[PDB]
Amino acid sequence: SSQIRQNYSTEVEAAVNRLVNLYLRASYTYLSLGFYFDRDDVALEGVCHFFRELAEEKREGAERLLKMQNQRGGRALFQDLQKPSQDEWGTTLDAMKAAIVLEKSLNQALLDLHALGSAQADPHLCDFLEHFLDEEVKLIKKMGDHLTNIQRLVGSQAGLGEYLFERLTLKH
Amino acid sequence: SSQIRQNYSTEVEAAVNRLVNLYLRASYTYLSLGFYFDRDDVALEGVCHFFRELAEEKREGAERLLKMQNQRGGRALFQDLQKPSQDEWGTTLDAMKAAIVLEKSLNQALLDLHALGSAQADPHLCDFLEHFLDEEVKLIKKMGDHLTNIQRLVGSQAGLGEYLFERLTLKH
Amino acid sequence: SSQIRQNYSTEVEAAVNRLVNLYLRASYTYLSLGFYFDRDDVALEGVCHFFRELAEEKREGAERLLKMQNQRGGRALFQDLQKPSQDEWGTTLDAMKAAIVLEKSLNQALLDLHALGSAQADPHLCDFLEHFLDEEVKLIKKMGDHLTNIQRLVGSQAGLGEYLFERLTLKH
Amino acid sequence: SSQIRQNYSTEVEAAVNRLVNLYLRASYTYLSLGFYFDRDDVALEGVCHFFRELAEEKREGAERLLKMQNQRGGRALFQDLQKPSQDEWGTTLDAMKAAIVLEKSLNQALLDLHALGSAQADPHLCDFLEHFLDEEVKLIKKMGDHLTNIQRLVGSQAGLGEYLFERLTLKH
Ligand SMILES: [Pd+2]
Ligand SMILES: [Pd+2]
Ligand SMILES: [Pd+2]
Ligand SMILES: [Pd+2]
Ligand SMILES: [Pd+2]
Ligand SMILES: [Pd+2]
Ligand SMILES: [Pd+2]
Ligand SMILES: [Pd+2]
């Protein structure tokens, strides 16, 4: 029951649903990261804000994919959202490392989807991901920049460096 | 590891975590409801908007609970988010009925939490839910109003009534 | 006699000329659809406006293709514009069905052209269609949405439903 | 001699007078803390400002309680204000620890008063404390956040950390 579907493979439709799940899972992970840094015994507001902003971005990405699914005449199918991989996230450095791992996995899923689109001769999908692809590269570059600065600040005054990074790099 | 926790029972802490899960689940359900009404073979924009707005409201509720959890020195614990109970939601009437069922369950969970707060002599919790409690009563009243209007419009021109309700009651 | 042509195949050049013809033909079809709904014995202004707007959009598309043809050093070649397939277009539903058929055919021609561009290793063409491709998907989604609403409104009060759709969905 | 008193127990009236004393004592303690950090041999302006702001807040709280006492037809009774527990307050960390101890004691007194109100079936009192209760939870969370940051900054460059916290966290 679609009267509009054209050149939209069942393979891409399913891959888009899986990507929505991955984006929502990422959003959930960032929600957990954000609130961890808001704990009174962690108390790094710039870090909390950074991850809460990412939770919003990932949710927005999922919503864009869902809009596209309907635009193409595919059917959204939702699965459980697995809880994030940790309950406590360690240091800012630990968290930023986890975030980059997460983003690399999202990026790989985008790359896999683009490849499927190319194999299926689906240029609209290709065009649509173009939005996701650059945004992801920009985000990963930012995270790498952050990680380098966090790492430079460890030294052997780790608490001091963690405070200074949150105060002087992150938005608060 | 909290230096601030005071008069905040482990029972309430756990109940707050469960309530966060219920709110996030509700948000997820509303996301699914919203996109269903955006299908080209359903195509009721006012209904899509209504449920997408509710998805945002429920997410906001979860975020408020998480902020409060940290304010009190409790620790957020996240669980899986179960997928919504249906993949396709039927008519506007079916959907509005499902929504009221969902809201009644959230309201009951709020009532249960307030009762626990009262049993634990936790007035801050009581005060905090006061926000949730009125918002929920207002929302359920609105949904009941909608259901009555949807029901009046069935008659034996169901398609006509569904169109008119979306056009003339819902925001588009 | 071009001093600029580079990586622009004769196959793509010809396909672009054919696409210009298809867009102009579509524009002509929409002109006819628009004026049919302006007949005193049809008199559905929102429908007239919808199709007249599409006539303008298709003409604009042809003009964009012609601009691109010259940008690449190809040579515009015009053919006859075949008259639209009907002189009278029936109900709003009949017309919207005809419109979606027309758009699917344009979309297929765009897809065919992108495939040719990919086969000819012509990335500028690919980039250029990216504009056409999303606009077409958006338009077809809109038409599918319209068709669903028109269909819901037939019931057995067809005149009533046709009036209400024109009044409450379409711009007038 | 009141013509307005209704449902206002002598127990609550007395507890309100004691709470006014506790708030005024807290204000006095914060006055002392503030001026200590303004000493030329301490010289941490952000810390001075933080505690002077709290002195004002506590005085305001006492004034609100006194207004409520009269609104209910109770009679304000003032006792001596005991001098603060220290003449010199040590490091920012020492001071912030003392402040949280002080706030926990105020919060416990508020909780005790709410419990008395509930036992006496005095809902206006309950409503009134609702203002005090959330403000106190917010303040204690802030103090806990501060303490965590101060503690992270000790390291073995304590002077450096104390300076940086005052410069980069506190308002100056
Ligand atoms: Pd924070
Ligand atoms: Pd934040
Ligand atoms: Pd919609
Ligand atoms: Pd919407
Ligand atoms: Pd007209
Ligand atoms: Pd017109
Ligand atoms: Pd000063
Ligand atoms: Pd000051």
Side-chain angles (χ1 to χ4, degrees), chain A residues 1-52 54-126 128-129 131-134 136-170 172, chain B residues 1-52 54-126 128-129 131-134 136-170 172, chain C residues 1-52 54-126 128-129 131-134 136-170 172, chain D residues 1-52 54-126 128-129 131-134 136-170 172:
Chain A
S1 193
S2 171
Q3 288 164 304
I4 70 175
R5 197 174 178 148
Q6 184 170 208
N7 194 221
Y8 194 61
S9 64
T10 59
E11 294 89 351
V12 166
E13 177 185 17
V16 170
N17 284 151
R18 281 189 293 276
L19 194 60
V20 166
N21 190 86
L22 295 178
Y23 270 74
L24 294 174
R25 273 217 293 214
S27 182
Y28 200 19
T29 294
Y30 286 131
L31 181 70
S32 178
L33 275 155
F35 280 94
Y36 166 80
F37 285 95
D38 179 58
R39 284 167 53 158
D40 75 271
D41 61 354
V42 177
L44 292 161
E45 185 188 323
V47 186
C48 171
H49 287 12
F50 178 78
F51 291 125
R52 290 198 66 190
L54 286 171
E56 174 179 338
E57 292 182 17
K58 299 305 174 188
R59 193 226 343 121
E60 287 169 352
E63 288 164 354
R64 183 166 329 251
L65 288 160
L66 288 163
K67 178 177 181 76
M68 183 274 288
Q69 181 80 104
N70 278 344
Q71 283 174 321
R72 293 297 304 276
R75 295 294 172 248
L77 284 174
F78 294 99
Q79 302 303 332
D80 289 3
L81 289 194
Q82 291 306 309
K83 72 179 191 179
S85 67
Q86 303 170 216
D87 294 323
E88 301 182 301
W89 297 96
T91 62
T92 303
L93 179 56
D94 290 327
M96 197 66 66
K97 287 175 179 169
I100 295 167
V101 166
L102 175 60
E103 291 303 324
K104 283 170 173 183
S105 76
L106 290 179
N107 196 216
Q108 190 55 241
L110 294 170
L111 292 173
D112 292 347
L113 179 57
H114 192 280
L116 178 62
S118 303
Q120 292 291 333
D122 192 339
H124 182 271
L125 180 76
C126 152
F128 169 85
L129 295 168
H131 212 105
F132 287 87
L133 299 173
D134 189 56
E136 196 58 31
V137 159
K138 288 173 63 198
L139 178 58
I140 296 170
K141 174 62 165 64
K142 175 69 67 57
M143 290 182 171
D145 290 352
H146 286 166
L147 274 167
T148 290
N149 283 96
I150 294 160
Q151 292 165 143
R152 189 154 38 216
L153 285 163
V154 181
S156 181
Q157 318 243 264
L160 172 64
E162 189 161 27
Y163 179 75
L164 290 167
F165 182 76
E166 181 269 338
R167 287 288 93 180
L168 300 180
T169 292
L170 299 177
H172 64 264
Chain B
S1 193
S2 171
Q3 288 164 304
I4 70 175
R5 197 174 178 148
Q6 184 170 208
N7 194 221
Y8 194 61
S9 64
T10 59
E11 294 89 351
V12 166
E13 177 185 17
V16 170
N17 284 151
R18 281 189 293 276
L19 194 60
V20 166
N21 190 86
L22 295 178
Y23 270 74
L24 294 174
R25 273 217 293 214
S27 182
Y28 200 19
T29 294
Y30 286 131
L31 181 70
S32 178
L33 275 155
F35 280 94
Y36 166 80
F37 285 95
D38 179 58
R39 284 167 53 158
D40 75 271
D41 61 354
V42 177
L44 292 161
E45 185 188 323
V47 186
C48 171
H49 287 12
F50 178 78
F51 291 125
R52 290 198 66 190
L54 286 171
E56 174 179 338
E57 292 182 17
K58 299 305 174 188
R59 193 226 343 121
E60 287 169 352
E63 288 164 354
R64 183 166 329 251
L65 288 160
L66 288 163
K67 178 177 181 76
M68 183 274 288
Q69 181 80 104
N70 278 344
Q71 283 174 321
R72 293 297 304 276
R75 295 294 172 248
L77 284 174
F78 294 99
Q79 302 303 332
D80 289 3
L81 289 194
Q82 291 306 309
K83 72 179 191 179
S85 67
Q86 303 170 216
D87 294 323
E88 301 182 301
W89 297 96
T91 62
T92 303
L93 179 56
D94 290 327
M96 197 66 66
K97 287 175 179 169
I100 295 167
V101 166
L102 175 60
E103 291 303 324
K104 283 170 173 183
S105 76
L106 290 179
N107 196 216
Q108 190 55 241
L110 294 170
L111 292 173
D112 292 347
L113 179 57
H114 192 280
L116 178 62
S118 303
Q120 292 291 333
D122 192 339
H124 182 271
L125 180 76
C126 152
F128 169 85
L129 295 168
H131 212 105
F132 287 87
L133 299 173
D134 189 56
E136 196 58 31
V137 159
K138 288 173 63 198
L139 178 58
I140 296 170
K141 174 62 165 64
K142 175 69 67 57
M143 290 182 171
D145 290 352
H146 286 166
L147 274 167
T148 290
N149 283 96
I150 294 160
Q151 292 165 143
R152 189 154 38 216
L153 285 163
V154 181
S156 181
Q157 318 243 264
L160 172 64
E162 189 161 27
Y163 179 75
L164 290 167
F165 182 76
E166 181 269 338
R167 287 288 93 180
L168 300 180
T169 292
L170 299 177
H172 64 264
Chain C
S1 193
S2 171
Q3 288 164 304
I4 70 175
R5 197 174 178 148
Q6 184 170 208
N7 194 221
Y8 194 61
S9 64
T10 59
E11 294 89 351
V12 166
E13 177 185 17
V16 170
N17 284 151
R18 281 189 293 276
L19 194 60
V20 166
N21 190 86
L22 295 178
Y23 270 74
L24 294 174
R25 273 217 293 214
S27 182
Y28 200 19
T29 294
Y30 286 131
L31 181 70
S32 178
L33 275 155
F35 280 94
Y36 166 80
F37 285 95
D38 179 58
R39 284 167 53 158
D40 75 271
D41 61 354
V42 177
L44 292 161
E45 185 188 323
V47 186
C48 171
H49 287 12
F50 178 78
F51 291 125
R52 290 198 66 190
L54 286 171
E56 174 179 338
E57 292 182 17
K58 299 305 174 188
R59 193 226 343 121
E60 287 169 352
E63 288 164 354
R64 183 166 329 251
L65 288 160
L66 288 163
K67 178 177 181 76
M68 183 274 288
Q69 181 80 104
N70 278 344
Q71 283 174 321
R72 293 297 304 276
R75 295 294 172 248
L77 284 174
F78 294 99
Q79 302 303 332
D80 289 3
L81 289 194
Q82 291 306 309
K83 72 179 191 179
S85 67
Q86 303 170 216
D87 294 323
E88 301 182 301
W89 297 96
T91 62
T92 303
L93 179 56
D94 290 327
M96 197 66 66
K97 287 175 179 169
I100 295 167
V101 166
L102 175 60
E103 291 303 324
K104 283 170 173 183
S105 76
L106 290 179
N107 196 216
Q108 190 55 241
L110 294 170
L111 292 173
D112 292 347
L113 179 57
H114 192 280
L116 178 62
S118 303
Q120 292 291 333
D122 192 339
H124 182 271
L125 180 76
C126 152
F128 169 85
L129 295 168
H131 212 105
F132 287 87
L133 299 173
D134 189 56
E136 196 58 31
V137 159
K138 288 173 63 198
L139 178 58
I140 296 170
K141 174 62 165 64
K142 175 69 67 57
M143 290 182 171
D145 290 352
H146 286 166
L147 274 167
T148 290
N149 283 96
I150 294 160
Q151 292 165 143
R152 189 154 38 216
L153 285 163
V154 181
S156 181
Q157 318 243 264
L160 172 64
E162 189 161 27
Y163 179 75
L164 290 167
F165 182 76
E166 181 269 338
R167 287 288 93 180
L168 300 180
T169 292
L170 299 177
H172 64 264
Chain D
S1 193
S2 171
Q3 288 164 304
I4 70 175
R5 197 174 178 148
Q6 184 170 208
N7 194 221
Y8 194 61
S9 64
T10 59
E11 294 89 351
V12 166
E13 177 185 17
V16 170
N17 284 151
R18 281 189 293 276
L19 194 60
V20 166
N21 190 86
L22 295 178
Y23 270 74
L24 294 174
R25 273 217 293 214
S27 182
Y28 200 19
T29 294
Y30 286 131
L31 181 70
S32 178
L33 275 155
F35 280 94
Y36 166 80
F37 285 95
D38 179 58
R39 284 167 53 158
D40 75 271
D41 61 354
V42 177
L44 292 161
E45 185 188 323
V47 186
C48 171
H49 287 12
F50 178 78
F51 291 125
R52 290 198 66 190
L54 286 171
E56 174 179 338
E57 292 182 17
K58 299 305 174 188
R59 193 226 343 121
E60 287 169 352
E63 288 164 354
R64 183 166 329 251
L65 288 160
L66 288 163
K67 178 177 181 76
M68 183 274 288
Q69 181 80 104
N70 278 344
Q71 283 174 321
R72 293 297 304 276
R75 295 294 172 248
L77 284 174
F78 294 99
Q79 302 303 332
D80 289 3
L81 289 194
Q82 291 306 309
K83 72 179 191 179
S85 67
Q86 303 170 216
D87 294 323
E88 301 182 301
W89 297 96
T91 62
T92 303
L93 179 56
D94 290 327
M96 197 66 66
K97 287 175 179 169
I100 295 167
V101 166
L102 175 60
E103 291 303 324
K104 283 170 173 183
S105 76
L106 290 179
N107 196 216
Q108 190 55 241
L110 294 170
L111 292 173
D112 292 347
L113 179 57
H114 192 280
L116 178 62
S118 303
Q120 292 291 333
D122 192 339
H124 182 271
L125 180 76
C126 152
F128 169 85
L129 295 168
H131 212 105
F132 287 87
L133 299 173
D134 189 56
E136 196 58 31
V137 159
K138 288 173 63 198
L139 178 58
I140 296 170
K141 174 62 165 64
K142 175 69 67 57
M143 290 182 171
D145 290 352
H146 286 166
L147 274 167
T148 290
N149 283 96
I150 294 160
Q151 292 165 143
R152 189 154 38 216
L153 285 163
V154 181
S156 181
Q157 318 243 264
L160 172 64
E162 189 161 27
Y163 179 75
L164 290 167
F165 182 76
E166 181 269 338
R167 287 288 93 180
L168 300 180
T169 292
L170 299 177
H172 64 264

